[PDB]
């Protein structure tokens, strides 16, 4: 009996939101403009009893990271040489070392501009066949063109830059938090238990590949299979492996590099000669460990189609960029044929080798970015990588069999695989509750699942952490919004007569039309975000009573001071 | 007797200022780069008894909007193709369809670059005569040049962009307001009554035209005639109409469009062939409604030159861009001859047709911006528009007659015609007043014309609204200044011992050397901005007394606490 | 006995820091983009008894100013014409007027592009010999090239821009200050007395020269000799003069200027013809005033090598940019030979003339910036300048003699010479001290060397001044950090129960484990920054006691209000 409303600040309570996360680096493109070096030391905290719903296929971190990478790794071409003076009538013949012919390359000859513009030099380069296009149908002829020269002018990548994926961390600006699921076999969506808060993510490697996920974070106890709706054939399946399989890939033949003058100051790097022995670019996977993996995926894949047998087949065919395994290695771009790898059947109970083609002229993502020329790297090249996961699609011609095929290249699905466990939220530090009072007239959100009385002992902790080119403007935009939110909070607390105090008591009587729970049933038996959810719809009524009450009270005081 | 100073916060009082307004859009160039989509719902409030002076010919909104439009609609050319490879020796002959010769166009032939640089293609386009210049005086010859190729390299407008005027709203940042005159026949300057405040303007269409104002907001009850000083012949007269007259304009002949290759990726759009019948580009106005309008302007124009007769004549002659009616329609640029329209006399008590020329190479405003090539639009084109107003100038050769002529093209005068009714002001929420107290030891400005005691009941309303490329930077710079102003306010209230409270009372005695009015004569019979105007010169004395008093008081308290 | 901790705000105390100072201008490149016009009126204040250590060879103002100048005066080339169409096979012969041959210049002829691209014009210019390079070794021949056309494409400086050094002021953002040494013969490093604070520096002229410092601020009473370590031969010596010597320099021959068409809109300015008489570019210094200066430097230079004789010799030889006196005059760039000037010996007790070469193609600083073409200025040119100081280096071949030579061109050393007297600091307005109290339950830093009790009478002064492309972003970044620092201060004062008050008293008892000094020995006999230095290591203990105490106190009050 005789309840009145009280206002609290620094309540551990939150709402679902979207806002620009800042890029954080340990200790090249990322750590030289978009990402601040900031050595984010691990600072996780477990939340005792909270439950949240998480959803991989709506997490705005993936679409933020896609825009961040696309923008950054288009902007990193801006200082470098345009190959516009190289769109020249290109005359070509078969490439040959004294040791043999190379079928993957042509030998081409052209005219180039010097820093003395009025003279032109006859010059030659070897080019990989998939970047050269024939210039007329009229006769079988030696005359060719660079493939980009009907669509875009390409930029060479400056040889100081390197594409090796550095680990990237994402972090919350002040007044926001990241929540993380620890639960085994989370299935990418639905109700989760054992949540933690972390001020930043673990390292996400910005690795780009089309059918096999290379160097990703491993699965924790058993194979996890994820998609929006397994019944719908139009949705990608992400498969996340527990025990790795290791892929070794190489260009086995030694290429020499030459520099061509191409006007004032600018220079073009191209393949000059091949040193000795010749063999095609290739990769190996250990056949038994692949078989075991393909089987162990199989028995988890069966549980969603229980009575049907399952079998694996080639990708959809056509253009290399979808029907093949793409990746970057040493700075060269490899495309490999996977027909040997995805070939088998399952119902119960040596090395395989892949062969590849190399390209230099590449369209980085889905026609959104500039055409890049990848400059050649000298000598032999090798990469070691871990296959962490598979991207699959499911085809009826049959009732007893399901048929699965490699697919990918909506680049978001690679970054979704590292970000399945994460959610972004906004802290809302104000709240109101009933109490028996009259006015006289351990970490960022740490308590959040607890009894409301316990959280009232730690209010200061959620109070302090409220305050602290695109890459510049978004930091200033984030910081100013964080300041403006804090000032609105303190201004309401001024207008209600609390005037900078964390727990505050007021003459507005509680109304049973809002809630009827006992004082102990509120204070001992409920957790703050549940109380907030219940009072939510009435909340905008309460603030009007507080403002008029303070205005009445100040007029009564201002009157009395003339007679006191 | 026994008055002391009191400090108030959220007083409805203001000063005249300039500060960059933010561009707002309903729901192409404006709403996709400079202007935020923000669907500004109408939120006007009338002010009861305030009077202000307004002045059209010094309103810094017009010069802000001019810079905003010039900057934006120069920046919208930045991504598009440069026609530098088109400055070529251009060889030309008369244009002819089997149906006849076209006198407005030449047929020109030239050499163009392909994405294969080492070959050149012979190619042709039709060009409108006013964009082509003859290349030597030596003989009457077929050799010509594009007009821009001695001054600037032109950029084509990208065909995704469209020039149709979307309505633009201007809004006040926090701590500022817009005031509006409702008064009929305001005459553009002087003392106004019935003012309103509005958080944003109505829609201003950014329409560009040189002699007749198209699609502007109409006059409310009778024809309004505006200028700085009607006696001075050197000043433009704006005339604002009550009942519209409707203009229909067309290109009646069907033009086919062709795309020319112009190096890698880039393409040029030009007129290829004309389909059939040929007739000159023309406009119509209904002759009786024009006559009635020209007469009804006449009887209001007489009242400033009472005894003299008035007559209308051609523009000043010379170059098309001043001596003709320019406008844009469907994306083509029309220039029309107005000699038929401004021809008549007045002393008391069918369609007219105009004929036109089309240009593609245009200098958008007074040599300030890039040269734009307007790409041709296929088929026949028509526009319907309302003539809202006239721009005039007055020529002595006579005593009985005044002679009036069309003039314009200082682009500000079109935007002045939509912004005549508006003023920008800064809220100054602090103030001091006398009271009988000792210290113990409905909308954004809504009340502003009222008795001071009444405004003291609504102080919170003026308190809350104090807080909330160039297009990015100017919003951060506006927001940070709004935060810094608020913090200075709260810091003074700290230094004076009010420490976050809206009405505050102090031991500094009022001094008759500042003012001598009775307590009721202050509090009942005056309005806040008048009291502020009166106390203005003394105000900087008062703040020194407040600061030293608080410092004395705190030392006295800090002493006593050792003995309390 | 019975001491308790008290918190103060606006304490005059500071720490050593770096933060980006803002450029300010009196009343062209500086005052039109990087530098605000703000006519910064002199506002120095002397500090009574403070001492600080200053160090010229670690002052981050010099490295900030270097980055500011390099960035600005590279960015000022961005709008102007690229000379890429001028890298042409250039055919040349000896230059001759009817009056004679000029040995410093060639006459060169070339082909240029018109705004009509398909025609080329035969055209000629005179060029200064040091900017032209011979194109093949095969024979002694008339064929040449512009020197930049193997490294960079140069930009012409737009003739509206001017390089005359305007005085630049550097100023502190809110929450920072600049401190200044007034002491005579400061020796560039170590403990200083008679310090002042000033909100901005005096005018620093951004003058660039390589061996003699022109137009710098003079020495105040006697010659000052400065370096990190005079024993180390690898360190530059700065010598700062008391009485000036005046240098007059000229190009005595009249050059006519011609404008060449170089594609659409763009134009190139070059030397056309020489009017009449011919004589080499030269400078004069008065021989007796130089001798006296070189001697008077000598007797101060002896005091660091007491028994040795001292003698002066030529610079190191090789490339002009280090081995010669560079400067800019009227917009031309002069390089002069100093062998006549630095030639003499000292042990105890007419005009000299220098001859020069002119260049147009210049690399502004150490290969960091673009290559600039300096356009020719018409007519004869003269400059008057004051030699303010010398840059020297010391070479063993001997025991009785020290040998000194001109050196420079690490551009920082010119700006170090104007900034030797300055230091940047951060105000830290919080502090804690002991007092006998229980809780009931003249300028920017002006006092800073005084007794702590006296500073407590002026706390408000240090309180108010806490609050108020790269050139835009750095001002927003600075302002937002200044706001965020202030909000953190006020938030701690909230969490400790002071809630916006300048002197505040608390129930936390003082602990002898921190300090043991008498109450008067603290309050009367010590100055705030010394007390701050002493309490420094314990300080982070104190804030934990304050936060838990306030939380205890608020819970005790919130309990009692139910029973009051
Ligand atoms: C690619 O083509 C070039 C041009 O024909 C080859 O270079 C020539 O090689 C022969 C070898 O006997 C020499 O005699 C010529 O003097 C070379 N010409 C030049 C311009 O250097 C080159 O060997 C070919 N490379 C491959 C791998 O096919
Ligand atoms: C998941 O996919 C299934 C189909 O794969 C959706 O259910 C229906 O399936 C039948 C048979 O293919 C169709 O005729 C219906 O049109 C489908 N309904 C819809 C709305 O598509 C099912 O809806 C999907 N799940 C969700 C959450 O929409
Ligand atoms: C003063 O201006 C107000 C607008 O603030 C006018 O209000 C309009 O009045 C008419 C009837 O006369 C209504 O139909 C409108 O809906 C009103 N509102 C608006 C926004 O137009 C008012 O008439 C004016 N009064 C005087 C005496 O000038
Ligand atoms: C503009 O000039 C071009 C070039 O002369 C004309 O195109 C030619 O038209 C004749 C019609 O008999 C054809 O025989 C030629 O083969 C065309 N030449 C090309 C290159 O296509 C064009 O018809 C002229 N158009 C107008 C409207 O004058
Ligand atoms: C408005 O214009 C008139 C003239 O049109 C200005 O008054 C004077 O007019 C006579 C006769 O033309 C001139 O000899 C004077 O030199 C004019 N005076 C000035 C100061 O120009 C009148 O001043 C103008 N109004 C204002 C506000 O200046
Ligand atoms: C300490 O430095 C101050 C400057 O802060 C010196 O003040 C100058 O003193 C002379 C007379 O000696 C005056 O003419 C100047 O006007 C003073 N002000 C300035 C800005 O120069 C002061 O002399 C120094 N005192 C000592 C003992 O070093
Ligand atoms: C630089 O060279 C040009 C080109 O030879 C000289 O210009 C010629 O001067 C003679 C003087 O008798 C004239 O007959 C020619 O008609 C000029 N040619 C042109 C293209 O104008 C120029 O005089 C030389 N200048 C110097 C100072 O050496
Ligand atoms: C200042 O320079 C001197 C040498 O010019 C440094 O002292 C030592 O000098 C001897 C003889 O040249 C060398 O063998 C030593 O190696 C020098 N020591 C070092 C650490 O370089 C002296 O150290 C320099 N001053 C400072 C502050 O380092
Ligand atoms: C797991 O994934 C499947 C995909 O078809 C989905 O239908 C299901 O709702 C998810 N959650 C659980 C708890 O099974
Ligand atoms: C390899 O795995 C596939 C897929 O289950 C299976 O068809 C095949 O029999 C396995 N073993 C061998 C030796 O290929
Ligand atoms: C309590 O709530 C009801 C329903 O909203 C309302 O009618 C009543 O006025 C409220 N009580 C008070 C004291 O206003
Ligand atoms: C109206 O406009 C005329 C223009 O000549 C001006 O002189 C006058 O001051 C304005 N105001 C009034 C109330 O007439
Ligand atoms: C049209 O208006 C003008 C201007 O007053 C007048 O001279 C003319 O007589 C009017 N009537 C006709 C039929 O032109
Ligand atoms: C009142 O005003 C006069 C004139 O400014 C001044 O001399 C006097 O000191 C003021 N009164 C007090 C109490 O200071
Ligand atoms: C003065 O400069 C010399 C340079 O060798 C340096 O060693 C010395 O420490 C400086 N300071 C003093 C007070 O001499
Ligand atoms: C000039 O100064 C130098 C340096 O001390 C000295 O050698 C010479 O004797 C002086 N006098 C003359 C006349 O050169
Ligand atoms: C005083 O300081 C000592 C040493 O840090 C500490 O053990 C003691 O607990 C402190 N006193 C109080 C009252 O906490």
Author numbering:
A (entry chain B), B (entry chain C), C (entry chain A): 32 to 58, 67 to 139, 148 to 309, 312 to 321, 321A, 322 to 358, 360 to 398, 412 to 457, ...
Q: Which text from the study accompanies this structure?
A:
Based on structural analysis of both the prefusion and postfusion conformations of gp41, nine positions were selected to disfavor the formation of the elongated alpha helices, which are characteristic of class I fusion proteins in the postfusion state. These substitutions were then made in the CH848 10.17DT Env, a clade C Env that has been modified to engage the unmutated common ancestor (UCA) from the DH270 V3 glycan bNAb lineage. Therefore, the double mutant at positions 568 and 569, which yielded well-folded trimers as evaluated by negative-stain electron microscopy (EM), was selected for subsequent characterization, and these mutations were termed “2P” to reflect their similarity to the two consecutive proline mutations, which have been shown to stabilize betacoronavirus spike proteins in the prefusion conformation. To further validate that the newly introduced 2P mutations did not disrupt the overall folding of the gp41 subunit, we determined the cryo-EM structure of the CH848 10.17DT DS-SOSIP-2P Env to a resolution of 3.7 Å. Our model spanned residues 32 to 664, and we were able to build N-linked glycans at 15 of the 25 putative sequons. There were several small, flexible loops in the gp120 subunit (59 to 66, 458 to 459, and 400 to 411) that could not be confidently modeled; but overall, the CH848 10.17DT DS-SOSIP-2P Env was virtually indistinguishable from the structures of previously reported CH848 10.17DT Env constructs, which lack 2P stabilization. Like most other previously reported structures of gp41 proteins in the prefusion conformation, the flexibility at the N terminus of the central helix precluded us from observing both of our newly introduced proline substitutions, and only Pro569 could be confidently modeled into our reconstruction.
